From Swiss-Prot, chains A, B, C, D, E, F, G, H, I, J:
Function, as annotated: Promotes microtubule assembly and stability, and might be involved in the establishment and maintenance of neuronal polarity. The C-terminus binds axonal microtubules while the N-terminus binds neural plasma membrane components, suggesting that tau functions as a linker protein between both. Axonal polarity is predetermined by TAU/MAPT localization (in the neuronal cell) in the domain of the cell body defined by the centrosome. The short isoforms allow plasticity of the cytoskeleton whereas the longer isoforms may preferentially play a role in its stabilization.
Outcome of substituting V33M: In FTD1; ultrastructural and biochemical characteristics indistinguishable from Alzheimer disease; accelerates aggregation of tau into filaments
Documented effect of changing S16F: In PIDB; markedly reduced ability of tau to promote microtubule assembly
Posttranslational mods: Phosphorylation at serine and threonine residues in S-P or T-P motifs by proline-directed protein kinases (PDPK1, CDK1, CDK5, GSK3, MAPK) (only 2-3 sites per protein in interphase, seven-fold increase in mitosis, and in the form associated with paired helical filaments (PHF-tau)), and at serine residues in K-X-G-S motifs by MAP/microtubule affinity-regulating kinase (MARK1, MARK2, MARK3 or MARK4), causing detachment from microtubules, and their disassembly. Phosphorylation decreases with age.
N6,N6-dimethyllysine sites (modified residues): K7
Source organism: Homo sapiens (Human)
Shown residues in whole-protein numbering: 622 to 695 of 758
Site feature Not glycated, where: K7, K13, K17, K27, K36, K39, K66, K71
Location of Phosphoserine modifications: K1, S20, S48, S52
UniProt comment concerning the protein's domains: The tau/MAP repeat binds to tubulin. Type I isoforms contain 3 repeats while type II isoforms contain 4 repeats.
UniProt note on tissues of expression: Expressed in neurons. Isoform PNS-tau is expressed in the peripheral nervous system while the others are expressed in the central nervous system.
Residues of this chain annotated as glycosylated in UniProt: K43, K49, K65
Annotated protein name in UniProt: Microtubule-associated protein tau
Subunit structure: Interacts with MARK1, MARK2, MARK3 and MARK4. Interacts with PSMC2 through SQSTM1. Interacts with SQSTM1 when polyubiquitinated. Interacts with FKBP4. Binds to CSNK1D. Interacts with SGK1. Interacts with PIN1. Interacts with LRRK2. Interacts with LRP1, leading to endocytosis; this interaction is reduced in the presence of LRPAP1/RAP.
Record cross-link Glycyl lysine isopeptide (Lys-Gly) (interchain with G-Cter in ubiquitin), residues: K7, K13, K17, K27, K39, K43, K49, K65, K71
Length: 74, 74, 74, 74, 74, 74, 74, 74, 74, 74
């Protein structure tokens, strides 16, 4: 006889307050990416990024995160 | 006899407040991406990004996230 | 006879307050990335980033995180 | 007969307050990355970053973290 | 007969207050990274960073951390 | 050339919570009021209360009040 | 050239919590008020209360108050 | 050339918590008030209270108050 | 050229906590007030209270108060 | 050229905690007040209280007070 009770309780908070957010300047000089290759052989669950240039501005009013995993294996 | 009870309880909060958000300038210089190759062989669940240039501005009023996974395997 | 009770309790807080956030300048000089290769053989759960240049500005009003994992194996 | 009770209790806080945050200047000179190779053989859960240049500005209003792991193995 | 009770209690705080944070200048001269190789053979849970140049400015309003691990093995 | 920008931001709150409010007894003994004169001569925006015996019970579930005035004169 | 920018930010709160409020007894003995004169001559914005016996019970669940005035004169 | 920037930030709070409030007894003995004159001559913004016997019970769950004034004169 | 920047930051608090507030007894003996004159001549912003017997019980769960004034004169 | 920067920062607090507040007895013997004159002549911003017998009980759960004044004159 096996009895398993799984009842975690979560009443947590992840929060923020901000009066004013601003005057943000993202102005990098432009750059160069040069990639030289001959043969590309990609097999079986392969993930790739080749030859990439990017500029990202991310300014959320709050970007709080809560990540939660629950796993029960019997 | 096996008895499994799975009843997690979640009353959490992920929140934010922002008075004012703004005056955000994304003005990078333009760049260059150059990719040279000959043979591209991509097989079996392969994901790729080749030769890419991008500019992303992301300014949510709040971009809070809650990610939750529940898995029970018997 | 096996009896397992799993009932962790979480009433925690991850929080922040900020009056004013701003006057942030991201203005790096542009750079160069040059990659030379011949043969790329990527197999079986391989992840890669080759030849990459990037500029990221990340200014959340608060970016608090709560990461939680619960695992029960029987 | 085996009886296991797992009931940890967490009422903790991770918090911060900041009056004013700002006047942050990220202005590095541009640099160069040059990578020369011939054969790239990547197999079985391999993760790589080759030939990379980056500039990151990260200025959260608070970026407090709480990381928690709960594992019960029977 | 085995009876195990696991009930740790945590009411701790990790906190900070800061009146004013600012006037931070990150302005390194640009540098150079040059890597020369021929054969790259990476197998079985291998993680690598080759040929890398980076500039990171990290200025949180508070970046307090609480890391906690709970493990019970029977 | 005159430019006036009036853009105040208000995300405030005035609030209350009360579990239970009650068993309030207003039972003053009766009294007497006597006012005597020969002539009343009232002119030009006169406000008056003469000879009064009022009994008032005021028990709101909350009587939170917010008064806000915005005036711009040019 | 005159430029006026008026942009105050208010994320404040006035609040209260009360578990239980009660068993309040207002039971003053009755009294007497006597006011005598021959003539009342009131002119130009006169406000008056003459000869009064008031009994007031005021028991709000919270009577939190916020008064805010913003005035810009040019 | 005149530039005026008025941008105060307020993230303050006025608060209270009370478990239980009560068993308040207002039971003054009744008294007497006698006021006598022959003539009242009131002019130009006169405010007055003459001959009074008031009994006031004021028991808020919280009577927290916040008064704020912002004035800009040019 | 005149530049005025007014940007004060307020993250303050005025607060109180009280477990229990009560068993307050206001039971003064009744008294007497007698005021006599022949003429009252009040002019130009006169404020007065003549002949009074007031009984006041004031028992807030908290009567925390915050008064703030901001004045900019140019 | 005149540049004035007014940016004070306030992260202060005025607070109190009280376990229990009570058993307060206000029971003065009744008394008498007699005021006599023939004429009252009050002019131009006169504030007065004549002939009074007040009984006041004031028992807040906390009556913490914060008064703040900011004045900039140019």
């Amino acid at each position: 006889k096996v009895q398993i009770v799984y009842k975690p309780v979560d009443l947590s908070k992840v929060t923020s307050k901000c009066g004013s957010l601003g005057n943000i300047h993202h102005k990098p000089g432009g750059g160069q990416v040069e990639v030289k290759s001959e043969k590309l052989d990609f097999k079986d669950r392969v993930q790739s990024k080749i030859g990439s240039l990017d500029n990202i501005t991310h300014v959320p009013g709050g970007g709080n995160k809560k990540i939660e995993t629950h796993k029960l294996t019997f």
